[PDB]
Amino acid sequence: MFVKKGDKVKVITGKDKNKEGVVLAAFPKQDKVIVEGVNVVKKHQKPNQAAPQGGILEVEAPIHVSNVMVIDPSNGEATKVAFKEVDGKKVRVSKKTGEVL
RNA sequence: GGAGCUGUAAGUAAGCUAUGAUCCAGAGAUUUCCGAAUGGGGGAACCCAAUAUCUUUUAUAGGAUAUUACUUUUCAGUGAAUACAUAGCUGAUUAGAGGUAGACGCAGAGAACUGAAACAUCUUAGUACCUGCAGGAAGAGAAAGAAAAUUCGAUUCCCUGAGUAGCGGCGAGCGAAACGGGAAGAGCCCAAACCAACAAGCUUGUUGGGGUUGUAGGACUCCGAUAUGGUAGUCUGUUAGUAUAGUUGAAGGAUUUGGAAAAUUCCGCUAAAGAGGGUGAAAGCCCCGUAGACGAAAUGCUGACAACACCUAGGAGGAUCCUGAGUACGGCGGAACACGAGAAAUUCCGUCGGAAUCCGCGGGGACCAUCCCGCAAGGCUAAAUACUCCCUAGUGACCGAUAGUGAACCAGUACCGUGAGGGAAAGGUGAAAAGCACCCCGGAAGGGGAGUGAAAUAGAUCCUGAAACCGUGUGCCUACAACAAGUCAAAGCUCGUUAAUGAGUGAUGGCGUGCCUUUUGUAGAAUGAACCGGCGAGUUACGAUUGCAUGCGAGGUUAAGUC
RNA sequence: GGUAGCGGAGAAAUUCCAAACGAACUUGGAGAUAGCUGGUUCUCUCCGAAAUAGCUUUAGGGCUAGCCUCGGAAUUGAGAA
RNA sequence: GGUGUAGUGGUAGGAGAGCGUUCUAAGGGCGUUGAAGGUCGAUCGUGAGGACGGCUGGAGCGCUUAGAAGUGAGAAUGCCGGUAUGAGUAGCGAAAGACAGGUGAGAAUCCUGUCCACCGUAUGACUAAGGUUUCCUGGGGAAGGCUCGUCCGCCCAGGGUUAGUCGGGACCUAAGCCGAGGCCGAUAGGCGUAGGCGAUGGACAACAGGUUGAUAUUCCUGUACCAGUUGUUUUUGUUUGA
RNA sequence: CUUCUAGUGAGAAAACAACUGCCCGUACCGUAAACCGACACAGGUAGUCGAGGAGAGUAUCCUAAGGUGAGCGAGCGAACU
RNA sequence: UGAAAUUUUAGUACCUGUGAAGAUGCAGGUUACCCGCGACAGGACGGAAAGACCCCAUGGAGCUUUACUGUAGUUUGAUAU
Ligand SMILES: [K+]
Ligand SMILES: [K+]
Ligand SMILES: [K+]
Ligand SMILES: [K+]
Ligand SMILES: [K+]
Ligand SMILES: [K+]
Ligand SMILES: [K+]
Ligand SMILES: [K+]
Ligand SMILES: [K+]
Ligand SMILES: [K+]
Ligand SMILES: [K+]
Ligand SMILES: [K+]
Ligand SMILES: [K+]
Ligand SMILES: [K+]
Ligand SMILES: [K+]
Ligand SMILES: [K+]
Ligand SMILES: [K+]
Ligand SMILES: [K+]
Ligand SMILES: [K+]
Ligand SMILES: [K+]
Ligand SMILES: [K+]
Ligand SMILES: [K+]
Ligand SMILES: [K+]
Ligand SMILES: [K+]
Ligand SMILES: [K+]
Ligand SMILES: [K+]
Ligand SMILES: [K+]
Ligand SMILES: [K+]
Ligand SMILES: [K+]
Ligand SMILES: [K+]
Ligand SMILES: [K+]
Ligand SMILES: [K+]
Ligand SMILES: [Mg+2]
Ligand SMILES: [Mg+2]
Ligand SMILES: [Mg+2]
Ligand SMILES: [Mg+2]
Ligand SMILES: [Mg+2]
Ligand SMILES: [Mg+2]
Ligand SMILES: [Mg+2]
Ligand SMILES: [Mg+2]
Ligand SMILES: [Mg+2]
Ligand SMILES: [Mg+2]
Ligand SMILES: [Mg+2]
Ligand SMILES: [Mg+2]
Ligand SMILES: [Mg+2]
Ligand SMILES: [Mg+2]
Ligand SMILES: [Mg+2]
Ligand SMILES: [Mg+2]
Ligand SMILES: [Mg+2]
Ligand SMILES: [Mg+2]
Ligand SMILES: [Mg+2]
Ligand SMILES: [Mg+2]
Ligand SMILES: [Mg+2]
Ligand SMILES: [Mg+2]
Ligand SMILES: [Mg+2]
Ligand SMILES: [Mg+2]
Ligand SMILES: [Mg+2]
Ligand SMILES: [Mg+2]
Ligand SMILES: [Mg+2]
Ligand SMILES: [Mg+2]
Ligand SMILES: [Mg+2]
Ligand SMILES: [Mg+2]
Ligand SMILES: [Mg+2]
Ligand SMILES: [Mg+2]
Ligand SMILES: [Mg+2]
Ligand SMILES: [Mg+2]
Ligand SMILES: [Mg+2]
Ligand SMILES: [Mg+2]
Ligand SMILES: [Mg+2]
Ligand SMILES: [Mg+2]
Ligand SMILES: [Mg+2]
């Protein structure tokens, strides 16, 4: 996928539109990704999970990769990603600015 | 290729990964046992060996490795009745077995139902089935031809000839070929005569040279040339390309509704990319892609180049020699030719008889003569043609879960049968499991809250949720009535609609024997339907003919085929 | 263990051959053939029969004619009462 | 378009004109401000049929023109599915059970006890075939059990089959079968010699007791036997040679 | 298996000690609810043992060892079968 | 605990008559308050089996013979070996 673990991304669709967070986990096979503080769900968990209350836990659920855009670290704004080889190494490049990664 | 990964498949647990994992492509290694199965056996996936080497034990037992089936080819050694020998036996060597792709090809053998309105000739049909052999194609193929326009010049396939010529209990039916137009195109090798070498027993076998034909050719004898061209040869190299992974690949933000925007509105932007797919609803500009550009370490495949290899001669004379024998052909009996013995050619098989050979031979649909055409009894040969089990990329006025493959799902499965064999049913929560923590009744199941969700009457028998069938509640009617159940008339009561000279129910009165099929005639005591739902029957191809329509009109029109 | 369907076996009954044997079972030819029975799905408008003759291995089938329907041509109008 | 005249039952069947369904093309549209579909309504047309509104539903679908058909079902003792009727009816598959206690949410049906009753050339004890885990232990009550079930030959989880001597193989053969060469035959193959396979037969060394929840001539105890190897000792033969 | 020689032969035999001896089956049901009958089916299923009194007896009745009370019951005590 | 055959929908009387000639359903008259339970079997030409008897089809099959046409075998001759 064009987005990678640890990236800073902006949500461009969904209830969490315009939010921005770091990518916590990536699932290329599902073409999905998890962004901290994005698409949080209340989950009714029995206490069988080493938590002696079970409770209603809060966890981020994956969102489709197409619904996020990588944040330009140099500019702080979301942008599309091109691929340019720099000094013999292929890297991602911001189409808005040209900055790497 | 660059960040996750340890399948479906969650879960725990333990781990791997920028020292580049998982993943993708080429090559390679390992690849238990059964299975042609092949050391022997055997009720497949098991059992028991011999030989040689190694290994465990003090040693026997035990373990590993290698070889050991049958037949064919070749060689060698041994070796009977029997003397020589052969046969047998031993060893080595060589190449076969079996399966497929339910397809396509060739051949052996080869039905019946059916049609003929019966049936035997005939037709179904040389089809179905069985068997052998194959190749990527096969088969055919280089004239003892087609013709008689005078010519053509291997074969195959297509259009046409033509439903014609013909065949046929002259019935039912079967049914050509040549000419013409096209796809593709290619020609070559022996036997023989003759010469040389070799061995034996002047000829007689092997090898080599020579020769490959019908306007006759070759040998042979003279001359002159030792060239000119070609190939349907090679794991020979070089080169180019291509197949099998990949890389790159433009352009959008807000606004309104909404859980969610791609939808609406407003302004923009890209296009060699507005094919398509996905994304929380319908996206040219979010993602995967698309147009375009680029890319191969390794192995295949193709084409070119070279290399090697192999074919390649002209003219003149005939005196003689050669030019495919148990063959051609004939009788008899069958069969194939559209042609069923018919006047019957031509071709093939079985049996018997049985030629000529260049002044020769065969054919031109009995046969003879003339003329014309050709030269059998030897072999090989690419392309055009046939088919798709498979792999890749696509396409569809093709199906959309009773459809479409039997099989969208762990299907040739479950199940049935001794066996061959027969053969199902079964797709959909939600955008996302966020798959209902906690509480209450209950032993649980299952519910009621409370929560998740936009929606839970989307709660896993989960999208939608029809009808039959069942049940609850009730507006009206019903216990003196004989009812194909309705229809026409109608009081009463109840209710207020697509606002219509309304709706529901209905005491009571009149009339009135279902639907379908098949019948002269059916309410029929003739037939069929238990009910509901789904599925379920004049279609297509090629021809004939008529109507209608269009174009052209004494003209009309192309078929195959090429782009 | 042997005998297999154009067959086997039969102290013989058409008796048995995997719960139906005057010719087993399965697959294929195959969608056998059926002058026979059954079924054949929407609507309205115009018109509207026949159950007869002849022949038929023909009689509950078929063919021609007769009767119906649609289109067309032409007439010194030929039809009906 | 108007007036007039006439006509307008109908099976087989002929002619004409239309409705509706799926899909294709073009144009023009409609849809999370809710499509298709479902359901209700007292709506429109001459007919097949067409709208409109409410509710349900949640993503596709009309309209006009033309085109193509797997294009219309009520019947085929049609096929498949579902559900009725008979009907809370037949049946619940040879026979003896009773009570007390226990367990349990729950007991005629499970466990224990007592009495009673049944079989006893069997309904007892061994075994071959066959079945193939049904055996034991601990749980369970969804489904199966013709009732019930706390229970089971059911379901879940673990566990269980110990051989020189028993049966079979490393032993033998009968019938039958296979069959090197071979004989025969359109193909395929048929038959068959040597040689093998093949028991239901022949040959062959261990028995008693004990032990577990489940195995026992298998494990253990005791005492044996059969075949063989190494070693020690004592014998005796070394080629007129055991 | 026992003999006979043919062949083969330098080592054999006895006692004792120690040691070796492979593969498959082994559960369970088995005149049945576990097999064949679609069923937890009144049928079929080879062989062995199969006691006592009376008795010829494995007949018959009642019993031993041992096993079992049959997988719907409770009432009532009509017709009819 | 829990089926089945059957089943066009049924609010499912009698007599006489009528009718495809043997009516629960049609005509006339008569009878009959509504719903059941236990019994019987006259009818629903009751259910079950597309009658086997009879006829028909230019159907099938098995069998017979001095039906027709063939044919395996058997035999005889010519001919090849
Ligand atoms: K084998
Ligand atoms: K194929
Ligand atoms: K025939
Ligand atoms: K006929
Ligand atoms: K060829
Ligand atoms: K023709
Ligand atoms: K005829
Ligand atoms: K030459
Ligand atoms: K998106
Ligand atoms: K798109
Ligand atoms: K290459
Ligand atoms: K002929
Ligand atoms: K010629
Ligand atoms: K829903
Ligand atoms: K009601
Ligand atoms: K009335
Ligand atoms: K009848
Ligand atoms: K008999
Ligand atoms: K039906
Ligand atoms: K029922
Ligand atoms: K009922
Ligand atoms: K238990
Ligand atoms: K034995
Ligand atoms: K045992
Ligand atoms: K006695
Ligand atoms: K006794
Ligand atoms: K019981
Ligand atoms: K009683
Ligand atoms: K009685
Ligand atoms: K009648
Ligand atoms: K009766
Ligand atoms: K018969
Ligand atoms: Mg083997
Ligand atoms: Mg016929
Ligand atoms: Mg090949
Ligand atoms: Mg792009
Ligand atoms: Mg936009
Ligand atoms: Mg012929
Ligand atoms: Mg001849
Ligand atoms: Mg000739
Ligand atoms: Mg002539
Ligand atoms: Mg000539
Ligand atoms: Mg070719
Ligand atoms: Mg569906
Ligand atoms: Mg299907
Ligand atoms: Mg709903
Ligand atoms: Mg639903
Ligand atoms: Mg009265
Ligand atoms: Mg009253
Ligand atoms: Mg009649
Ligand atoms: Mg009926
Ligand atoms: Mg008789
Ligand atoms: Mg029988
Ligand atoms: Mg046929
Ligand atoms: Mg639709
Ligand atoms: Mg249809
Ligand atoms: Mg129906
Ligand atoms: Mg009753
Ligand atoms: Mg009982
Ligand atoms: Mg007795
Ligand atoms: Mg048990
Ligand atoms: Mg237990
Ligand atoms: Mg029960
Ligand atoms: Mg043999
Ligand atoms: Mg035991
Ligand atoms: Mg035992
Ligand atoms: Mg009368
Ligand atoms: Mg009467
Ligand atoms: Mg009436
Ligand atoms: Mg009857
Ligand atoms: Mg009949």
TrEMBL record:
Among InterPro entries, the record links this protein to: KOW, Rib_uL2_dom2, Ribosomal_uL24, Ribosomal_uL24_C, Ribosomal_uL24_CS, Ribosomal_uL24_KOW, Translation_prot_SH3-like_sf
* Molecular function GO labels: rRNA binding; structural constituent of ribosome
Give the matching CDD domains: KOW_RPL26 (cd06089)
What does the record list as GO biological process? translation
A cellular component term from Gene Ontology for this protein is: ribosome
Q: Which UniProt keywords apply?
A: Ribonucleoprotein, Ribosomal protein, RNA-binding, rRNA-binding
Q: Which residues form the KOW domain?
A: 2-29
Reply yes or no: does the keyword Acetylation apply.
Answer: no
* Stated family: Belongs to the universal ribosomal protein uL24 family.
Subunit structure and binding partners: Part of the 50S ribosomal subunit.
The cross-references to HAMAP family, in alphabetical order and at most eight, read: Ribosomal_uL24_B
Q: What biological function has been recorded for the protein in this entry?
A: One of the proteins that surrounds the polypeptide exit tunnel on the outside of the subunit.
Q: What is this protein called?
A: Large ribosomal subunit protein uL24
To which species is this protein native?
Enterococcus faecalis (Streptococcus faecalis)
